[PDB]
Amino acid sequence: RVAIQEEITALNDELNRIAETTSFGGNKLLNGTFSTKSFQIGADNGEAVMLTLK
Amino acid sequence: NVQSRGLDVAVRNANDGISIAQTAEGAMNETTNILQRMRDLSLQSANGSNSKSE
Numbered sequence: 001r002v003a004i005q006e007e008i009t010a011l012n013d014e015l016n017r018i019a020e021t022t023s024f025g026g027n028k029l030l031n032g033t034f035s036t037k038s039f040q041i042g043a044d045n046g047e048a049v050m051l052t053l054k
Numbered sequence: 055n056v057q058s059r060g061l062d063v064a065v066r067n068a069n070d071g072i073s074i075a076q077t078a079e080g081a082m083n084e085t086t087n088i089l090q091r092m093r094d095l096s097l098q099s100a101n102g103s104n105s106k107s108e
Contacts, residue, residue, distance in 0.1 A: 027105050037102030045100065 029053050 019030045028034055030053060038048035099108070 024103070025105070027103075038100075039102045040097060040100040043097075045097070048100070048102070051102065 020028070022028070022030045032054070034053040036050045036052045038050050040048045042048070098104075
């Protein structure tokens with residue numbers, strides 16, 4: 001059980017690392033700092049769609 | 055005869071006025087082109103994928 005817990009702790013640290021290091025050019029995505037961002041997909045202003053990363 | 059001479063002066067003045075209008079309109083055409091470029095830049099900047107640097 002201790003060995004399994006050690007491997008589980010390693011995987012948990014890997015999960016935290018994946019959350020904290022995934023980025024798009026330097027803009028973090030999966031650590032919660034990326035709140036709702038509006039992508040402008042229209043030819044005129046005010047035609048944006050919100051995307052939320054948790 | 056004085057009417058004819060005045061008419062020649064009138065067509066000369068009208069040509070000068072058309073020249074001034076053409077020059078102003080070409081300048082404003084370049085202004086329109088620059089405005090369209092700025093509008094494209096503003097539309098690009100409004101996207102949520104951009105960070106502060108872009």
